[PDB]
Design an enzyme around this catalytic site. Sequence first.
Site, PDB file in Angstrom:
ATOM      1  N   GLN A  49      33.731  31.763  49.303  1.00 12.68           N
ATOM      2  CA  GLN A  49      35.003  31.053  49.079  1.00 12.68           C
ATOM      3  C   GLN A  49      36.183  31.988  49.264  1.00 12.68           C
ATOM      4  OE1 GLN A  49      32.747  29.572  45.413  1.00 12.68           O
ATOM      5  NE2 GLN A  49      34.638  28.406  45.373  1.00 12.68           N
TER       6      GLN A  49
ATOM      7  N   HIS B 157      36.604  28.707  52.789  1.00 12.39           N
ATOM      8  CA  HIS B 157      38.044  28.541  52.505  1.00 12.39           C
ATOM      9  C   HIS B 157      38.980  29.235  53.459  1.00 12.39           C
ATOM     10  CE1 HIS B 157      36.944  27.336  48.103  1.00 12.39           C
ATOM     11  NE2 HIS B 157      36.591  26.435  49.014  1.00 12.39           N
TER      12      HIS B 157
ATOM     13  N   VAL C  95      29.486  42.219  38.421  1.00  6.71           N
ATOM     14  CA  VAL C  95      28.650  42.097  39.576  1.00  6.71           C
ATOM     15  C   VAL C  95      28.250  43.467  40.156  1.00  6.71           C
ATOM     16  CG1 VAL C  95      29.074  39.829  40.471  1.00  6.71           C
ATOM     17  CG2 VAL C  95      30.684  41.627  41.085  1.00  6.71           C
TER      18      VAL C  95
ATOM     19  N   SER D 106      33.643  30.785  39.439  1.00 11.71           N
ATOM     20  CA  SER D 106      33.500  29.904  38.273  1.00 11.71           C
ATOM     21  C   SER D 106      33.059  28.493  38.715  1.00 11.71           C
ATOM     22  CB  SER D 106      34.806  29.814  37.453  1.00 11.71           C
ATOM     23  OG  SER D 106      35.869  29.245  38.267  1.00 11.71           O
TER      24      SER D 106
ATOM     25  N   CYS E 287      42.497  28.256  67.352  1.00 14.75           N
ATOM     26  CA  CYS E 287      43.214  27.348  68.260  1.00 14.75           C
ATOM     27  C   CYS E 287      43.171  25.907  67.829  1.00 14.75           C
ATOM     28  CB  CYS E 287      42.606  27.382  69.729  1.00 14.75           C
ATOM     29  SG  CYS E 287      43.671  26.408  70.809  1.00 14.75           S
TER      30      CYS E 287
ATOM     31  N   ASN F 172      28.236  35.835  36.434  1.00 12.34           N
ATOM     32  CA  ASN F 172      29.631  35.664  36.158  1.00 12.34           C
ATOM     33  C   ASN F 172      30.009  36.098  34.722  1.00 12.34           C
ATOM     34  OD1 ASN F 172      31.871  34.554  37.850  1.00 12.34           O
ATOM     35  ND2 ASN F 172      32.311  33.320  35.975  1.00 12.34           N
TER      36      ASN F 172
ATOM     37  N   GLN G  15      32.905  35.040  33.023  1.00 11.66           N
ATOM     38  CA  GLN G  15      33.272  33.796  32.379  1.00 11.66           C
ATOM     39  C   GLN G  15      32.197  32.806  32.518  1.00 11.66           C
ATOM     40  OE1 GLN G  15      38.186  33.582  32.689  1.00 11.66           O
ATOM     41  NE2 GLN G  15      36.931  32.792  34.427  1.00 11.66           N
TER      42      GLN G  15
ATOM     43  N   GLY H 232      30.338  35.972  40.917  1.00 13.08           N
ATOM     44  CA  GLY H 232      31.851  36.063  40.840  1.00 13.08           C
ATOM     45  C   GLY H 232      32.608  34.778  41.229  1.00 13.08           C
TER      46      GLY H 232
HETATM   47  N1  LIG Z   1      33.617  42.264  38.374  1.00 15.67           N
HETATM   48  C1  LIG Z   1      33.206  41.009  38.010  1.00 15.67           C
HETATM   49  N2  LIG Z   1      31.955  40.717  37.778  1.00 15.67           N
HETATM   50  C2  LIG Z   1      31.463  39.488  37.401  1.00 15.67           C
HETATM   51  N3  LIG Z   1      32.315  38.457  37.272  1.00 15.67           N
HETATM   52  C3  LIG Z   1      33.647  38.615  37.543  1.00 15.67           C
HETATM   53  C4  LIG Z   1      34.155  39.900  37.914  1.00 15.67           C
HETATM   54  N4  LIG Z   1      35.469  39.782  38.105  1.00 15.67           N
HETATM   55  C5  LIG Z   1      35.835  38.503  37.839  1.00 15.67           C
HETATM   56  N5  LIG Z   1      34.696  37.845  37.503  1.00 15.67           N
HETATM   57  C6  LIG Z   1      34.638  36.382  37.273  1.00 15.67           C
HETATM   58  O1  LIG Z   1      34.699  35.796  38.605  1.00 15.67           O
HETATM   59  C7  LIG Z   1      35.141  34.416  38.530  1.00 15.67           C
HETATM   60  C8  LIG Z   1      36.121  34.028  39.646  1.00 15.67           C
HETATM   61  O2  LIG Z   1      36.383  32.623  39.511  1.00 15.67           O
HETATM   62  P1  LIG Z   1      37.705  32.047  40.057  1.00 15.67           P
HETATM   63  O3  LIG Z   1      38.862  32.978  39.818  1.00 15.67           O
HETATM   64  O4  LIG Z   1      37.710  30.603  39.658  1.00 15.67           O
HETATM   65  O5  LIG Z   1      37.557  32.253  41.657  1.00 15.67           O
HETATM   66  P2  LIG Z   1      36.598  31.334  42.570  1.00 15.67           P
HETATM   67  O6  LIG Z   1      35.494  30.655  41.857  1.00 15.67           O
HETATM   68  O7  LIG Z   1      36.250  32.147  43.802  1.00 15.67           O
HETATM   69  O8  LIG Z   1      37.692  30.263  43.000  1.00 15.67           O
HETATM   70  C9  LIG Z   1      37.349  29.194  43.903  1.00 15.67           C
HETATM   71  C10 LIG Z   1      38.605  28.847  44.658  1.00 15.67           C
HETATM   72  O9  LIG Z   1      39.666  28.515  43.711  1.00 15.67           O
HETATM   73  C11 LIG Z   1      40.831  28.583  44.501  1.00 15.67           C
HETATM   74  O10 LIG Z   1      42.095  28.204  44.075  1.00 15.67           O
HETATM   75  C12 LIG Z   1      40.689  29.578  45.616  1.00 15.67           C
HETATM   76  O11 LIG Z   1      40.652  28.596  46.694  1.00 15.67           O
HETATM   77  C13 LIG Z   1      39.231  29.996  45.464  1.00 15.67           C
HETATM   78  O12 LIG Z   1      38.564  30.214  46.698  1.00 15.67           O
HETATM   79  C14 LIG Z   1      35.951  34.379  37.222  1.00 15.67           C
HETATM   80  O13 LIG Z   1      35.269  33.372  36.454  1.00 15.67           O
HETATM   81  C15 LIG Z   1      35.840  35.779  36.573  1.00 15.67           C
HETATM   82  O14 LIG Z   1      35.331  35.735  35.210  1.00 15.67           O
HETATM   83 ZN   LIG Z   2      42.423  26.943  72.810  1.00 19.23          ZN
END
Ligand SMILES: Nc1ncnc2c1ncn2[C@@H]1O[C@H](COP(=O)(O)OP(=O)(O)OC[C@H]2O[C@@H](O)[C@H](O)[C@@H]2O)[C@@H](O)[C@H]1O
Ligand SMILES: [Zn+2]
Lengths: 12, 294
Positions: free
Chosen positions: B111, B131, B256, B214, B139, B238, B240, B212
């Site tokens: 993502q 994403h 991670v 949510s 293009c 994760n 959270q 990594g």
């Molecule tokens: N070092 C780490 N190790 C383990 N977990 C981690 C670490 N750092 C952060 N986290 C966890 O990674 C998770 C990231 O979740 P989000 O911030 O919700 O990001 P993501 O799930 O990739 O978001 C999905 C989509 O939301 C959008 O707006 C944007 O488009 C993104 O691609 C968080 O829950 C955070 O606790």
């Molecule tokens: Zn083209």
Amino acid sequence: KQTARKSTGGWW
Amino acid sequence: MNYAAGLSPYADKGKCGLPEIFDPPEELERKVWELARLVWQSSSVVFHTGAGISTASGIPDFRGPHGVWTMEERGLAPKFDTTFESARPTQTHMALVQLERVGLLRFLVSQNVDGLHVRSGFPRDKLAELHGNMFVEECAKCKTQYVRDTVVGTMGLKATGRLCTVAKARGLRACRGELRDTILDWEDSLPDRDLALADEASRNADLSITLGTSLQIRPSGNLPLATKRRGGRLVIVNLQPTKHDRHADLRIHGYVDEVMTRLMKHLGLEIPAWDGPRVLERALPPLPRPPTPK
Ligand SMILES: Nc1ncnc2c1ncn2[C@@H]1O[C@H](COP(=O)(O)OP(=O)(O)OC[C@H]2O[C@@H](O)[C@H](O)[C@@H]2O)[C@@H](O)[C@H]1O
Ligand SMILES: [Zn+2]
């Protein structure tokens, strides 16, 4: 079937 | 504050700023060992990564304690230790390149838009960037893509200012389509072919492991469930909570980088060092598996 747009929601 | 990038102000940002949870060292040790067993005994392993695997590089996540949406929601700006150009692949980025080289990773669905999987050398034909990728433009006319060394310069699928050069009219004319960034805004359609491949790999996996993320944004956050439909297993890594915690066969709350360090240790695999930005279009054939650890 079901949408392929980036958002919040269910998998059913 | 992201608008600015002229992005939609109407998005639903989801649940931001939930407490982090940390497994105690012994449990974690137990979990990462169990992960290794799962990874060795499964024939098709798909990884799903989100913003949490780039935090050790200085890129903030979205919904973590200091996530870009978490800060915005409370009237604060977030903080960037690095630029996208200067960000370095983390030990988790580099571990996934090695897993794929030895045949322990079938596919990788991301993502993240930070471009690090590509720049770490991860082969593009095993990767779905659902994403977008800040370094890739595309293009509008003919869908051909161009990977650049620098960020393309817009978000939200806007014209970057360059034009397409693929040959049209039986060689007589250039396409000349407007190139556009590939960064989806809120409620844009996912790229068809990345989603179709990510969906195929997820449905056929017998192990999906999330790193990594949510898992709040669909459809990418729902792909790891596909595996459970054929009786495959789900592992969530994760700090959270995630939206699908209740479906996990194994849940690990830890950093991670730390989880993947240990996993590789149990697998007998070194984590390669990164040379600098290197685009690999197609996977090499697989190196042989390391000696059976168990
Ligand atoms: N070092 C780490 N190790 C383990 N977990 C981690 C670490 N750092 C952060 N986290 C966890 O990674 C998770 C990231 O979740 P989000 O911030 O919700 O990001 P993501 O799930 O990739 O978001 C999905 C989509 O939301 C959008 O707006 C944007 O488009 C993104 O691609 C968080 O829950 C955070 O606790
Ligand atoms: Zn083209």
